[PDB]
Structure formats: C-alpha cells, structure tokens
C-alpha cells in the first residue's frame, strides 16, 4: 500500500517466530523500540499488528517515537511509547519502474497534526491560503496527495524501502501470540530434570503401562504427588520415578 493508506492486518492465536526476521541478514534496519532486539521469543502477547507502507530511504529515520517531517507527522504518526519494532529493507529492484513509478503516493499538505495510529484517506482540496477553496484547484489551492515518482537511476535517498512496523499489545484478554517453545531429546532411565508444560522438577523417567484418558496431561498419586505424565510430542505415558536418595 501507500503511506496515506497503510493497511494493517492483525494476527492472533498463533505461534509466531521472530528469529527468521532478526537473524535473516536481509533487512536494512531492525531498530526495536521499547523491547530488546533479542529475547522476543519469550514474550507472549495478546494480539500484534503489522503496518505496511513504502517510503524513501531518507524517510525511514522518521519512523521512530518522536520526529518531525512530512511523513512522520502528516502521513504516519508513531505513538510516543512504542513497544513493537520497525522493520525495513531496500526494494528498489522490484518496486521501482523504468520511466517513473507513480503507484506509491503520499500526503504533503494537511490542516492539523495527526494522532497516533490514524488512517485518513480523505482527498479534499486543502486550503493553503485564507480563501475557501470549495473544491477547485488553480486558486492557490493545493491537492493533499502527491506522487513519489520512483526511478531506478536515483541516489540511495530516493529508493523504495518497504517498511513493516510490527506493533505489540498486551491487553487484559489472555495472551494468544506466544513464542516458539523448543524441546529436547527424551532422556529416560536416568536421574534428570524434566521441564514439561505445567510440571517442573526432577526424577527418573521410565516406561509406564497406565492408559490415560485422551484429554489429560499428567496424573498425581493419593497424596497429591505427580508420578506419571504424558509426553507432549508423542502420545506416550511415562512414569516419573523419584531419583534415588538416602543417608550415609
């Protein structure tokens, strides 16, 4: 999309991985405001957003909490306390067109400072002077939307840069967007420490013949002591044997 009609798309109820974006060696800028560039796979959010727009090279710096410019004020207003992360990369090879690329537009003239997270696709003739334009151009009245005109034979400052401003949000609803929880090999018949979903402790993992109902995860004994659990990956029932101890 363009800068004045940035189409966001919310994505929730998913296991999203951010390692394919940070450790990609393909993006130009990866300035993550608020949150750290790493350890983002351990922050479970409710719902995330993805703002998409194409700007020039010298306009990527304006996408930050607190800036001044024609794009950072009249086109896209980033909030002061931003917790997501801005992702941008060069796209001059496919976005630019030989002879002029007039498919990406932006708004120059407005009447007031824009608010954070606002999309105004209004196309009324803004009054530059004091006289009411009433909807005619040629009387010192200027059109708000202007063309970019991308050309491959330009400097680095006039090249298309697709920007994906990922936004985060932690609402009162239960968090759905979580992080990829990695797993390890199945260690059995040894005094080790298990790290299952709800259970955490130590013990000897052995084979079990108990057949659990196909909706449960673990099971406790008469004294509320867990002794048999089910593997998360495979539908197998294990027997947590207490690791041997004693006195000398």
């Amino acid at each position, epitope marked *: 999309a363009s800068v004045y009609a940035w189409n966001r798309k919310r994505i929730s109820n998913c296991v999203a991985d951010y390692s394919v974006l940070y450790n990609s060696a393909s993006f130009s800028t990866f300035k993550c405001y608020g949150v750290s560039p790493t350890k983002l796979n351990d922050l479970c959010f409710t719902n995330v957003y993805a703002d998409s727009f194409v700007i020039r090279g010298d306009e990527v710096r304006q996408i930050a909490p607190g800036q001044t410019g024609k794009i950072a004020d009249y086109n896209y207003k980033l909030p002061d306390d931003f917790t997501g992360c801005v992702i941008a990369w060069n796209s001059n090879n496919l976005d630019s067109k030989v002879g002029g690329n*007039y498919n990406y537009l932006y708004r120059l003239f407005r009447k007031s400072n824009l608010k954070p997270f606002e999309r105004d696709i209004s196309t*009324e003739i803004y009054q530059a002077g004091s006289t009411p*334009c*009433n909807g*005619v151009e*040629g009387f010192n009245c200027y*059109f708000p*939307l202007q*063309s970019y005109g991308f050309q491959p034979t330009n400097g680095v400052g006039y090249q298309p840069y697709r920007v994906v401003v990922l936004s985060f949000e932690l609402l009162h609803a239960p968090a759905t967007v979580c992080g990829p929880k990695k797993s390890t090999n199945l260690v059995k018949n040894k005094c080790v420490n298990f790290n299952f979903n709800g259970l955490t402790g130590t013990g000897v993992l052995t084979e079990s013949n108990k057949k659990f109902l196909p909706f449960q995860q673990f099971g406790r004994d008469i004294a509320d002591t867990t002794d048999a659990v089910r593997d998360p990956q495979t539908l197998e029932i294990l027997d947590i044997t207490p690791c041997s101890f004693g006195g000398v």
Partner: antibody
Amino acid sequence: QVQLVQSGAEVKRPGSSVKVSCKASGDTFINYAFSWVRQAPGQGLEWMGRIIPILDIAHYAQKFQGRLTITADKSTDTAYMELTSLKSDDTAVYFCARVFRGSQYWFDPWGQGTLVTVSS
Amino acid sequence: EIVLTQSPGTLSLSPGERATLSCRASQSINNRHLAWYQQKRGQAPRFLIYGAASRATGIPDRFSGSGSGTDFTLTISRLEPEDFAVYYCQQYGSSPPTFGQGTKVEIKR
C-alpha cells in the same frame, strides 16, 4: 494548456465498441486529470466520465453509468474512452479535455473530436 | 444547478455592441461558479471566463463577465469580427457538470 490531440474518425456499425485515445503533451500527466464530453449535432455537451490518473479512480454520470469504461495509460500519457453497446443515438463528437483534481473542475483545454457514427 | 436554458437565441443583428448570453437555471447557483466557452464552426472549443469575474489565460480584455446570483450575463464590449462563435455555459457549482445551448453571433444581410 497542453496540446491535446485525439485519434481519427472511427466510423463503425451498431454493435461494435471502440476506444478513443488522447495524448498528453507539455507538462506531466500524473498531475492533472482528463475527462470526456460528447457533442451531438443538435444536442448539447453532456459530461460522461472523468478519471483521476494519480488516484486511478474514475467517475460516471447518471445516464452513462455501466455502459462506459474509461481508463488511462500513465506510461505514454494517454487517456482511453471505451464505450460498449454503441447505439444509433450515440452519434456525437467526443472531445478530450484536461481538468483539475478535485470535486469541481472546468475544461480549460480541448482536444480535436472523433466521429464514431454507427451507420456502417 | 440542473439546466442552463439560454435566454437569447440569435445575436446576428449587429457586431458592434455588447451581448447578454443569459444562462438561467432553476436552482440557485453557487458562489459565482460558471465557466464560459467559445466554439466556432464546430471545432475544439476554448475557455473564456472562470468564476464569472476573472479573465482566462490568454483571453484579451475584450470580454466582461457579470452576475453574482442566478441571472448571469456575459457582456462583450466592442464586438470584433473574430467573435462570431457560439458561447456556452458550465455551472461547476453542483455535482453533475451541465452545459447550455448557446447563441450564434453572425452579421446581418
């Protein structure tokens, strides 16, 4: 304003659609919009459509809606006016004109005129 | 804002005075939103006056627009032999742009 030129007289028969072209000299084409108006012998000028090149959107009147398909060509600065179902009452001189972007506009320049009378 | 019935029908009496070109309408016009034209011998027209008050680019001061309500008039002082065309009207104050009929100005015989 700009030196607007149109195509030649495309004399056809009732039951064959055509598309008239209109070049754009002088200044750029992604800055000023074009329109189309017909002029029939004895009748007056009736506005049909006005396409915005920068916004890639077009408009239609109340008596020509659905029966016309007006497009543009931003590669060579040319406007296309394709009219389907050319009836015998469509004998009119179609003029090309450039308008200003906005709700209201006026036809400052003019083209040449195309005769597409369906009597073949 | 929907019709532009021309009051005069023929001004071929004498090309040595002014004209009227009264473009009446049923609905009240907007704040002087009227455009005049000039078409000679069935060819490409030309823009004459915008806003009914200002002169167009390249048009000499031989014309004069008047009217601010609904009875707009166009007076052409010292009519020249060149002004032998049909003057139209365009009320661009409403949503649908409509035109009028015109008046054929010629000489007397």
